[PDB]
Amino acid sequence: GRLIYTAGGYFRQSLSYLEAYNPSDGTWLRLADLQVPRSGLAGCVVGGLLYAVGGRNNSPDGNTDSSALDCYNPMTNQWSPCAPMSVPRNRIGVGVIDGHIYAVGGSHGCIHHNSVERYEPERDEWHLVAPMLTRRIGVGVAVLNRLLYAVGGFDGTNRLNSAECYYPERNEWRMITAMNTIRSGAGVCVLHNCIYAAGGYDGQDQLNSVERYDVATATWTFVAPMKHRRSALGITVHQGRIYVLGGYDGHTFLDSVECYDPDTDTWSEVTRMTSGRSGVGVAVT
Numbered sequence: 415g416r417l418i419y420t421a422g423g424y425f426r427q428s429l430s431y432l433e434a435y436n437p438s439d440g441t442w443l444r445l446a447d448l449q450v451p452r453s454g455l456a457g458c459v460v461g462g463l464l465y466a467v468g469g470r471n472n473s474p475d476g477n478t479d480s481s482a483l484d485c486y487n488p489m490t491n492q493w494s495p496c497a498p499m500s501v502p503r504n505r506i507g508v509g510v511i512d513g514h515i516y517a518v519g520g521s522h523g524c525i526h527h528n529s530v531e532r533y534e535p536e537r538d539e540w541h542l543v544a545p546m547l548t549r550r551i552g553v554g555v556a557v558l559n560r561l562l563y564a565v566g567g568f569d570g571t572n573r574l575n576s577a578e579c580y581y582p583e584r585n586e587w588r589m590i591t592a593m594n595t596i597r598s599g600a601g602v603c604v605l606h607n608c609i610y611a612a613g614g615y616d617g618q619d620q621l622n623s624v625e626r627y628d629v630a631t632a633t634w635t636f637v638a639p640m641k642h643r644r645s646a647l648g649i650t651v652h653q654g655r656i657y658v659l660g661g662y663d664g665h666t667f668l669d670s671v672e673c674y675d676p677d678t679d680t681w682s683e684v685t686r687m688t689s690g691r692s693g694v695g696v697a698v699t
């Protein structure tokens with residue numbers, strides 16, 4: 415069995431919560447808090463270990479963007495610091511290829527990174543790789559066919575419908591077909607050989623629309639929209655279905671968790687998070 419882990423987030427200030435949802439029995443485990451509160455981080459798993467990457471601690475005492483990489487072992491219920499990234503990356507995107515973590519874009523104050531760096535858990539080291547063609551914060555990241563895709567975001571001036579992909583063997587990026595919609599702060603994941611981009615902000619409205627990229631045709635197609643429009647949502651895939659967790663809709667910090675079934679092309683509300691929040695990091699293990 416695997417659980418859906420949600421780390422950090424925001425509600426009034428950046429949060430330290432680490433909770434794990436079991437889709438079989440509907441329960442939430444309350445696990446060890448993060449050592450430093452953070453929102454705008456990303457989560458991922460390598461070798462059964464959960465990683466919390468980047469983010470920002472927005473507290474009553476100030477705002478500090480994070481270059482941290484922290485590792486949580488479900489077997490020990492303990493967080494351990496790892497080697498930090500070259501720069502702080504708030505509103506970061508992350509993807510894993512061959513057990514290596516890619517930290518994509520994100521911001522440090524007013525700096526909107528196009529830089530990308532890769533972590534090796536086997537050496538506890540980060541190294542920069544080729545930078546993206548576009549600066550991207552609030553970026554979605556997907557791994558498909560051993561390529562790393564960076565989708566949407568905000569480049570420091572405009573919110574983006576563009577997307578690009580990274581070729582690890584060549585160490586280079588190329589632009590791909592742009593989405594139908596501009597999405598800054600969307601949830602992006604891969605399911606059944608397709609990239610999904612759900613929600614996000616188009617510059618005027620919080621979105622409930624969801625679109626899917628088909629590699630062979632290089633096209634983005636709309637699929638069933640979510641019940642609740644949201645940005646800064648957590649997203650993951652568990653047992654052939656997509657789960658979206660929380661987020662912000664322009665008025666409320668959502669506790670809604672929706673689940674997308676690709677066989678029926680329908681979204682269903684399956685649980686609530688223990689408290690409404692946005693900007694979480696999510697992963698499954």
Ligand SMILES: C[C@@H]1CN(c2ccc(C(=O)N3COc4c(cccc4-c4cc(N5[C@@H]6CC[C@H]5COC6)c(C(=O)O)cc4F)C3)c(Cl)c2)[C@H](C)CN1C
Pocket residue numbers: 423424453454455505551552553568573598599614615645646647661662664692693694
């Ligand atoms: C003081 C509070 C502070 N709030 C918030 C404070 C914190 C958060 C939060 O979790 N973060 C900060 O953002 C993000 C986080 C994670 C990923 C993406 C974003 C993000 C949100 C954006 N924004 C778009 C879509 C969401 C956000 C606002 O709406 C336009 C935008 C944009 O602009 O393109 C770009 C983004 F990369 C972490 C949020 Cl979501 C709200 C609210 C604004 C209410 N306020 C009263």
